[PDB]
Design a protein around this ligand. Structure first.
Ligand code: FAD
Ligand code: FAD
Ligand code: NAD
Ligand code: CL
Lengths: 338, 263
């Protein structure tokens, strides 16, 4: 029928501020860089939407990274992401201010959030997009991979507002912070509080005291079923330490007990774009490759010269990772010294 | 307890390959399957049936030939199957698909737990389960790694990029599933009992779902164009010397010369 239909008076492009330890995650800044170009193309403003327990100096950083406007909705209930709290706050602000488009980083939580909002407002949502463009009138052209990346689709939300999408992280470049930019902070008071129906009973940091997470590591040293045993992962830790990188693995590695889920790379785990990905005893299933095929360089170490992973590896060695790794790590260490 | 599993028949997109030489899409071994994340959702429902005695209904919105997926569900021990099939539902985006599914579920009475896959491997949107949950006013947890029931609560393990978490919610609720053990085997007997089952087929008119909320008519989004992306062929330097020390020397001197490894 008519819910979510455009009024014609909608304006501005909004970027959702996903935050951790109070600070925006980097995909926020990625989207502010891209959406700055889109907002300039259609002569509309770029807004950052900050739902938090404590804004700190974050609106200032958002302005320096391209935002003209920063909407802030602050409450203690917003300390941690929750579907019920954030969907409510985000939808009250859409209703109040009437944006043209909304852009959400396709993180685990963004992928939870986006479709809740879209269904609540009754509007269109394009998922985990990789290419974006805009017409002078503000109509956003959403392009995205589908079918495991085998098909690209270009999609429009012509009549419903706001036009929504989630956007793949690590795709778009942020702008360098500009101290000379100016913007406007708008403090939004919640009209209706909600009770969160979803209680968190365990919330544990996956990365330890000062250690490296695969998520942001410049090098990833990853092991599969071909590592043979959990203890042999110490080889990958040694290589990571020599490089200043982090250790990852395949879903098969998780299943065999070699590593815990937070180090899993692939479509059901993390997608990483390190400078080097060392794929050690990993066949290169399509589900794994989904998570690491945009690594700058892939180095494959595998006993099977027909391992699919070789298909996409600029460099590699056919052989036993258990003999090759410690020679490789030593040789790299020697080069890096003195 | 009553459980509904939302299942989707998909082409097996894991079998698709773009040849980097020709930039053409090769479809060798691509058949219609049960969406793998839906096999995880179903196996999770089945595990709860084994443990607690739950009644399990599987529902899909698909063309006639999607019936085979429902049969596969019954063959592994789902109790009931429903096929929502009508050209009026075709052309649906995720809003239109979730509207159809949410209205179907409501018509038969909202169960204690609705399980979805995390995503379907064709569309790859991961939107339908949360949109269903919103349409039905229910709480959600997406991308479950484990699901358990304790009294009147569902206990769900879910991660994000920084945190490993466990959440609880009261029934009725919606969970989308990232992983479970592989769906159990369907025996010959299982498949025969499934073949003999009645699977009702529901039109939009039968369910009194308005035409303007479903299919293309109910879709805010429209795919305007699709194309095979270009894939740049990689011409790897792969060393296969007998002596791993030799292979490693060659590899490292190349990584050095090509500015991959620095001091
Ligand atoms: C819906 C779905 C989602 C999935 N999600 C993911 C995901 O997110 N990430 C994921 O990784 N997978 C995922 N998978 C799984 C995927 O299909 C594969 O099962 C998995 O990636 C294989 O892991 P592997 O390469 O470690 O093991 P295998 O395929 O068993 O390969 C082991 C390799 O080790 C090699 N080898 C053996 N011994 C040695 C040695 N001594 N030295 C060197 N090499 C050796 C072999 O030659 C082989 O190539 C998913 C699958 C489904 C169906
Ligand atoms: C190339 C391409 C790109 C597309 N891009 C978009 C887009 O960005 N936005 C959009 O709104 N639509 C898109 N669509 C339409 C979309 O695929 C359909 O609306 C589809 O019915 C549901 O979305 P999905 O396949 O992403 O499934 P998902 O949202 O990933 O499915 C999640 C879960 O919902 C349940 N579910 C999904 N479909 C059904 C079904 N038919 N019956 C039962 N349960 C189901 C299953 O449990 C499933 O695992 C696209 C289609 C194509 C071919
Ligand atoms: O998107 P796409 O390209 O995969 O296009 P599509 O129109 O074939 O499918 C989109 C959605 O509509 C459903 N669908 C298609 N024909 C249907 C029918 N006759 N009855 C019920 N559901 C139907 C599909 O299962 C899918 O969920
Ligand atoms: Cl709700």
């Amino acid at each position: 029928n008519t819910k979510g239909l455009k009024t014609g008076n909608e304006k501005d492009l909004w970027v959702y501020v996903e935050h951790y330890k109070g600070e925006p995650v980097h995909v926020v800044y990625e989207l502010l860089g891209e959406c700055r170009k889109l907002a300039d193309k259609c002569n509309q403003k770029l807004a950052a939407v900050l739902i938090t327990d404590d804004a700190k100096d974050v609106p200032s950083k958002l302005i320096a990274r391209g935002a003209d406007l920063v909407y802030v909705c602050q409450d203690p209930a917003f300390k941690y992401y929750s579907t019920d709290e954030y969907t409510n706050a985000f939808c009250e602000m859409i209703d109040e201010y009437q944006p043209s488009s909304v852009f959400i980083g396709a993180t685990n939580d963004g992928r939870d959030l986006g479709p809740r909002i879209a269904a609540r407002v009754n509007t269109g949502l394009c998922a985990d997009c990789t290419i974006l463009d805009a017409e002078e009138d503000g109509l956003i052209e959403w392009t995205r991979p589908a079918a495991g990346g085998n098909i690209m689709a270009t999609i429009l939300c012509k009549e419903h507002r706001p036009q929504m999408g989630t956007v793949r992280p690590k795709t778009f470049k942020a702008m360098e912070p500009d101290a000379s930019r100016t913007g406007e902070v708008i403090n939004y008071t919640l009209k209706n509080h909600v009770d969160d129906r979803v209680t968190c009973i365990r919330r544990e940091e996956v990365v330890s005291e000062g250690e490296m997470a695969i998520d942001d590591a410049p090098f990833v040293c990853s092991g599969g079923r071909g590592m043979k045993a959990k203890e042999n992962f110490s080889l990958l830790y040694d290589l990571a330490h020599a490089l200043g990188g982090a250790v990852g693995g395949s879903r098969a590695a998780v299943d065999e007990g070699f590593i815990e889920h937070p180090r899993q790379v692939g479509q059901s785990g993390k997608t990483v774009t390190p400078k080097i990905y060392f794929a050690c005893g990993i066949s290169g299933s399509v589900q794994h490759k989904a998570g690491m095929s945009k690594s700058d360089t892939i180095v494959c170490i595998n006993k099977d010269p027909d391992a699919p992973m070789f298909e996409i590896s600029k460099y590699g060695i056919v052989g036993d990772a258990l003999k090759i790794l410690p020679l490789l790590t030593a040789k790299i260490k020697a080069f890096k010294e003195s | 307890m009553n459980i509904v599993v939302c299942v989707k028949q998909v082409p097996d997109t894991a079998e698709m390959k773009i040849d980097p030489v020709t930039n053409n899409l090769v479809r060798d071994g691509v058949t219609n399957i049960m969406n793998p994340y839906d096999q995880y959702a179903l196996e999770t429902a089945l595990q709860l049936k084994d443990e607690l005695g739950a009644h399990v209904t599987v529902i899909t919105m698909g063309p006639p030939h999607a019936e085979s997926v429902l049969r596969d569900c019954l063959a592994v021990g789902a109790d009931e199957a429903k096929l929502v099939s009508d050209r009026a539902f075709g052309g649906a985006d995720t809003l239109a698909t979730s509207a159809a599914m949410a209205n179907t579920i409501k018509h038969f009475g909202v169960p204690d737990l609705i399980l979805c896959g995390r995503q379907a491997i064709d569309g790859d949107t991961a939107q339908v389960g949360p949109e269903i949950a919103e349409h039905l006013g229910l709480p959600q947890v997406t991308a479950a790694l484990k699901v358990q029931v304790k009294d009147d609560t569902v206990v769900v393990d879910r991660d994000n990029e920084q945190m490993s978490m466990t959440f609880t919610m009261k029934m009725p609720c919606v969970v989308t599933v990232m992983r479970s053990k592989d769906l159990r085997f369907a025996s010959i007997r299982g498949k025969m009992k499934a073949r003999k089952a009645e699977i009702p087929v529901y039109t939009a008119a039968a369910l009194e779902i308005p035409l303007d909320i479903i299919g293309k008519a109910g879709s805010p989004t429209q795919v305007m164009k699709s194309f095979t992306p270009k894939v740049t062929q990689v011409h790897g330097e792969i060393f296969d010397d007998e002596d791993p020390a030799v292979a490693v020397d060659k590899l490292v001197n190349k990584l050095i010369e090509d500015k991959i490894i620095t001091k």
